[PDB]
């Protein structure tokens, strides 16, 4: 769920408020996403979007009433490392992995302020 994804990004980027810093950035970071990613950070968000789309395709995710944004899973942050839990069932585990991979991706790419609150004409 979004609560967990927020904590994961803070795990990798302890100075950030991720639901502010990484929402409405580029063509992909935030609800929806279309067009060509504007930079590597925006590409991290495109990959994450694709990951959530694949999660919705899984037989195990079709059995729950809640989407990737509201589906709670278990993970830990320790020494700024993210670990998804073996106690997660299949859908939860898949979403946990999407989130972990994106949090790590965000931490490894430049942040370009010119792409924050991007005009949708660009997408
Ligand atoms: Ca998106
Ligand atoms: Cl990690």
| Pairwise CA distance, residues 47 & 51, whole Å | 6
Q: Where are the beta strands (DSSP E) in the chain?
A: 75-78, 81-84
Please state, as a whole number, how many other Cβ atoms lie within 10 Å of the Cβ of residue 103.
Answer: 27
Q: Which residues are part of the catalytic machinery?
A: 48, 99
**1-123: in CATH 3.40.50.2000:** no
Phi and psi torsions of 105, nearest 5°: -55, -50
Nearest ligand for residue 82 CA? 2
With contact defined as beta carbons under 8 Å apart, do 71 and 91 qualify?
A: yes
Solved how? X-ray
Per DSSP, the three-state class of 44 is helix
With contact defined as beta carbons under 8 Å apart, do 91 and 54 qualify?
A: no
| Pairwise CA distance, residues 75 & 6, whole Å | 12
Number of H helices, E strands in the chain: 4, 2
Phi and psi torsions of 52, nearest 5°: -65, -40
Rg of the chain in Å (alpha carbons): 14
The reported resolution of this PDB entry, expressed in Å, is: 1.6
Per DSSP, the three-state class of 76 is strand
With contact defined as beta carbons under 8 Å apart, do 87 and 74 qualify?
A: yes
Domain locations in the chain? Answer: 1-123
Q: How far is the CA of 123 from the centre of ligand 2 (A)?
A: 30
């Amino acid at each position: 769920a979004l609560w967990q994804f927020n904590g994961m990004i803070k795990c990798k980027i302890p100075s950030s408020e991720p639901l502010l810093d990484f929402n409405n950035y580029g063509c992909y970071c935030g609800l929806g996403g279309s067009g060509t990613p504007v930079d590597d950070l925006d590409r991290c968000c495109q990959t994450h979007d694709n990951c959530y789309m694949q999660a919705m395709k899984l037989d195990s995710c079709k059995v729950l009433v809640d989407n990737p944004y509201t589906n709670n899973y278990s993970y830990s942050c320790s020494n700024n490392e993210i670990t998804c839990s073996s106690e997660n069932n299949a859908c939860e585990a898949f979403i946990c992995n999407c989130d972990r991979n994106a949090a790590i991706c965000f931490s490894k790419v430049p942040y370009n302020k010119e792409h924050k609150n991007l005009d949708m004409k660009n997408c």
